């Protein structure tokens, strides 16, 4: 909070444009702020700060290390990107930033279904994944690795449930690396519960959910909560396609969606009508 407040107040974002040492500093502080936001334990501002730093450029010499292309083979011009700056004994940890970025993206972006705005993902890695390393192929499986843990976690988080996603994450191979603790893990775990519940409803053919009552807390899958404040906020709505006649007394949801596919069909017919209407408006001017 304090770092973000000071940078935005002091108006120091137009002195980093020219003066090249200050730029690297600028990148260094933006990265650190996004890491700190992640690691005491919310997704946003952490997603916003960190995504902005990334994605783009490749190309990252910009805090550390690394040299661009190309450099260092050529020639005597090495000494520009090896003197702007980079400073030593810092960086701050590579890896840690990457975990923060990918995890932040996963919580935000997966809930941007309704269903079917289908969706060009907003990260450099994420868009790549389907063509790249998820794909449909590599040979043939088979997590757990390393980074394909994150891919496995994304598959589990989408559907299903939750439990599998937690198992890959908590555990194994990835987390323990944060020096800002267990605290960050607990916050992130709660965020995973919230967004796993959010995605899980949509979905469920074509609904029903709260199956049952008490089980809904229990399996989705942390005990036993606010209960009502968490469950109501996640379900609610009403925006977009309808859910609910929700009866909170018996804790039963009587969706009556009417309907998934028919809504889309009507949307296509509306879309076609607006083009034709506009086309014919121009013709009556002419």
């Amino acid at each position: 909070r304090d770092g973000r407040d000071l940078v935005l107040r002091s108006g120091v974002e137009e002195t980093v444009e020219k003066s090249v040492h200050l730029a690297i500093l600028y990148n260094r502080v933006i990265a650190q702020l996004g890491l700190a936001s992640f690691a005491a334990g919310d997704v946003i501002q952490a997603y916003n700060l960190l995504s902005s730093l990334w994605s783009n450029r490749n190309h990252d010499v910009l805090i550390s290390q690394r040299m661009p292309d190309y450099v260092k083979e050529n020639d005597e011009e090495e000494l520009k990107f090896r003197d702007l700056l980079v400073p030593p004994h810092a960086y701050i940890q590579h890896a840690q930033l990457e975990l923060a970025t990918m995890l932040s993206t996963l919580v935000v972006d997966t809930p941007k279904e309704a269903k079917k705005p289908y969706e060009g993902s907003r990260h450099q890695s994420y868009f790549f994944r389907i063509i790249n390393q998820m794909a449909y192929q590599p040979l043939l499986g088979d997590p757990v690795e390393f980074r394909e843990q994150l891919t496995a976690a994304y598959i589990n988080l989408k559907l299903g449930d939750y439990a599998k996603a937690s198992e890959v994450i908590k555990n194994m191979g990835a987390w323990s690396m944060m020096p800002n603790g267990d605290e960050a893990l607990k916050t992130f775990l709660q965020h995973l519960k919230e967004a796993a519940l959010r995605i899980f409803c949509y979905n469920n053919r074509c609904n029903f959910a709260t199956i049952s009552v008490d089980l809904m807390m229990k399996k989705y899958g942390l005990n036993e909560n606010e209960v009502k404040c968490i469950i109501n906020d996640i379900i609610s709505e009403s925006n977009s396609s309808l859910i609910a006649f929700w009866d909170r007394e018996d804790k039963y949801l009587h969706v009556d969606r009417s309907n998934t596919s028919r809504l889309q069909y009507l949307v296509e017919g509306i879309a076609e009508s607006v083009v034709e209407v506009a086309q014919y408006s121009e013709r009556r001017v002419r």
């Binding site: 009417s258 309907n259 009507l266 017919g269 034709e276 013709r283």
Partner: protein
């Protein structure tokens, strides 16, 4: 078992004719116990005078064909020839014997050919118009290789083409016909009958009429109204304490079953579930868009008229 598409067969009737005698080379591929002859092409050979074999001729033809292709899913499989199928005979048999051996060209994977004899004239007294054979013994050199023939049955595809030809034939009770717009819908009792009526209706002239139709709309309406009234009559005929003999027995049992099924569906339906009503609503959506399409056509027609 020789698999032939049916465009192939029509082509063979054209190629069999008109000129005396014609022959050609047949191509395709093979899979296991089936040989798929998928195409062919002709050549100028006289099969009743030992022309142009040799087996220089076979080699030359093969090279030319290969050049024309390359795809390995049309490879040379064998020869087609206009008649003789054993009066006669010997000339056709002789051409075959000559062809393998001097050359040994080309495309094989077993010592082979396939022979299709086409009857040149249209005959059916005892004649079989396309006859299929596959070499057996198969001496692999005897002078230039000789043969005896195992008869193979001719058969057709696979999926859509064969079915399409058959369906087209079936239609004919009025018209003889493609598959064309407007029709068909095909869930029968009722749709098929409607389609038949439509076909009869369509063409009389494209039109000696203004105002209003009485042809298909009362044929469809009559069939539906007859079905309703008839079903009521049959059920009523049961409804006098008889389950046996009245209609033969037999109508009554069917009607009773229909009543029970509809009632059961209705009871289950509302409310968990609505489903046939929702299907009716998606029909209304479709109908609304059909109205919109008609309206778009009318708007375009006004602009078209005002711009011509």
């Amino acid at each position: 078992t020789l698999v032939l598409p049916p465009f192939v067969a029509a082509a063979i009737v054209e190629h069999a004719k008109r000129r005396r005698n014609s022959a050609g080379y047949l191509v395709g591929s093979r899979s296991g116990n089936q040989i798929t002859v998928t195409d062919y092409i002709p050549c100028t050979h006289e099969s009743t005078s030992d022309v142009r074999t040799r087996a220089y001729a076979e080699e030359l033809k093969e090279r030319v064909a290969l050049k024309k292709c390359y795809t390995p899913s049309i490879t040379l499989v064998g020869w087609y020839a206009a008649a003789t199928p054993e009066p006669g005979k010997e000339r056709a048999f002789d051409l075959w014997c000559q062809a393998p051996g001097a050359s040994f060209s080309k495309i094989r994977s077993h010592n082979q050919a396939v022979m299709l004899l086409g009857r040149m004239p249209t005959a059916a007294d005892l004649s079989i118009r396309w006859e299929a054979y596959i070499t057996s013994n198969m001496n692999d050199g005897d002078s230039l290789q000789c043969e005896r023939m195992q008869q193979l049955t001719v058969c057709v595809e696979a999926e859509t083409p064969s079915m399409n030809v058959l369906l087209a034939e079936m239609i004919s009770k009025t018209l003889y016909n493609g598959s064309m717009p407007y029709p068909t819908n095909r869930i029968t009792n009722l749709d098929r009958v409607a389609v038949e009526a439509e076909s009869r209706e369509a063409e009389f002239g494209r039109k000696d009429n203004s105002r209003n139709d009485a042809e298909p709309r009362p044929v469809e309406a009559a069939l539906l109204n007859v079905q309703n009234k008839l079903h009521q009559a049959i059920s009523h005929a049961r409804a006098i304490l008889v389950s046996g003999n009245k209609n033969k027995s037999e109508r009554q049992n069917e009607s009773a079953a229909v009543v029970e099924n509809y009632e059961a569906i209705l009871a289950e339906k509302s409310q968990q579930s609505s489903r046939d009503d929702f299907i009716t609503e998606s029909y209304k959506d479709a109908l609304m868009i059909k109205y919109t399409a008609a309206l778009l056509r009318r708007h375009v027609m006004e602009i078209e008229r005002h711009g011509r």
